[PDB]
């Protein structure tokens, strides 16, 4: 159900802890330092929102914004 | 015609047999996507309807299922009797290679159904489960 391929299920199964309270994995226990089973995908290259390093009209299959005041008909 | 179409199954000869036996009235045929003919039988006719189904030339010999349903929150009930609860009996005839469904409507004040274990002895655990999970009592 992830439309960004952010949450993934690794082939690692070596879990099991002493306390149940420590089984609640926070954000620092989940975010890994690389792209996993879907390496090359990036959701923000499809989204049309203004992004640090991505102006309006810079996403895939997306045109540059024509100004509302533009001279062309 | 697609296999998922909402069919009424009035072309089933068991419906014609029921119309010949108990009259064209006294039961309501429901058009569902279950693939089986579903008939709403009144409570006092249930034992004799089951007895008639058990004495057909190719009778309905196995009680496939028997369970209740809470109709109190069901908003989309068109072509259905006024029911607070319902009890459905799913019966299978192997010689006909067909199956029928028998729905009995119930009100809140009288959740009493005549027992079905005198006809199908596997109904004991199904009626116990209906009395456990629902409030339906079997006489």
């Amino acid at each position: 159900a992830c439309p960004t391929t952010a949450i993934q299920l690794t082939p690692d199964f070596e879990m099991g802890e002493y306390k149940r309270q420590d089984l609640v994995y926070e954000k620092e226990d989940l975010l890994i330092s690389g792209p996993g089973k879907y390496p090359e995908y990036n959701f923000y290259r499809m989204a049309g929102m203004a992004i640090d390093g991505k102006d309006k009209g810079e996403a895939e299959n997306e045109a540059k914004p024509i100004d509302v005041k533009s001279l062309l008909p | 015609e697609p296999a998922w179409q909402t069919r009424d199954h009035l072309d089933d000869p068991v419906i014609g047999e029921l119309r010949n036996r108990f009259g064209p009235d006294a039961f309501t045929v429901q058009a569902t996507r279950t693939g089986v003919p579903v008939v709403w039988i009144k409570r006092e006719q249930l034992l004799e309807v089951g007895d008639f189904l058990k004495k057909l030339p190719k009778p309905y010999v196995m009680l496939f299922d028997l369970h209740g349903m809470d109709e109190r929150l069901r908003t989309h009930r068109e072509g259905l009797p006024a029911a607070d609860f319902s009890v459905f009996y799913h019966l299978i005839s192997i010689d006909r290679n067909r199956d029928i469904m028998l729905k009995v409507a119930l009100a809140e004040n009288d959740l009493h159904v005549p027992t079905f274990t005198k006809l199908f002895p596997n109904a004991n655990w199904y009626e116990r489960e209906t009395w456990d999970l629902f409030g339906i009592t079997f006489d």
Binding site: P3, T4, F43, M46, A47, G48, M49, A50, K56, G57, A59, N61, E62, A63, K64, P65, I66, D67, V68, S70, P73 | -
Partner: protein, 227 residues
Amino acid sequence: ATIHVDGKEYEVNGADNLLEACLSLGLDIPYFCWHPALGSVGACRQCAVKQYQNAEDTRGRLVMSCMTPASDGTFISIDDEEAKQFRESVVEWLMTNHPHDCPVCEEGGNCHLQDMTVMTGHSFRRYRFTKRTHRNQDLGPFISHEMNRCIACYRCVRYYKDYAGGTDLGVYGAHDNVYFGRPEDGTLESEFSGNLVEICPTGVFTDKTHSERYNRKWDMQFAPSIC
């Protein structure tokens, strides 16, 4: 007055609209530009049904439910082939240039465009060309502006001008580079600009106060209260 929907008789008002008569009966007709408190226009063409002349008629004619009176003796059809595929084409046209940013959008499970895209049953895409974009505006501390999400059903400008009497919002531009907003950057000085969050069926006008500390609609624990 009585009407016939899908060969079924219904007793509706004769002095009201056909779209609101059908929606009052629990029937589902998609709509974008119509609001119960703003009247009816033709800014979209989403409420299309097929109207006949008499009881025995096959061809019909595609009319708008929000622009046809619900007079006595009308014979309309909602879920025939032609009206359904035309409404699918209209949501396809509206979603032809729509940004692929639903999970990062403020509407999410509150969006009317999502419900009317699912309701028309349009999932596959055959539009392979480029989309359309617009620059955003700073509308103040309460209204976040994301103009790319717009489908140009004119409900915001109609509410803000005709209903609310405000002098800030408006329509600019032309055929396809149409714009809905202020002539400059600034705060919407009308006292009813917050209703644009739910008046807009898309994520253009959204709640900035809910943009900060945001959750989806299904995650909200609601209660009926008094302001």
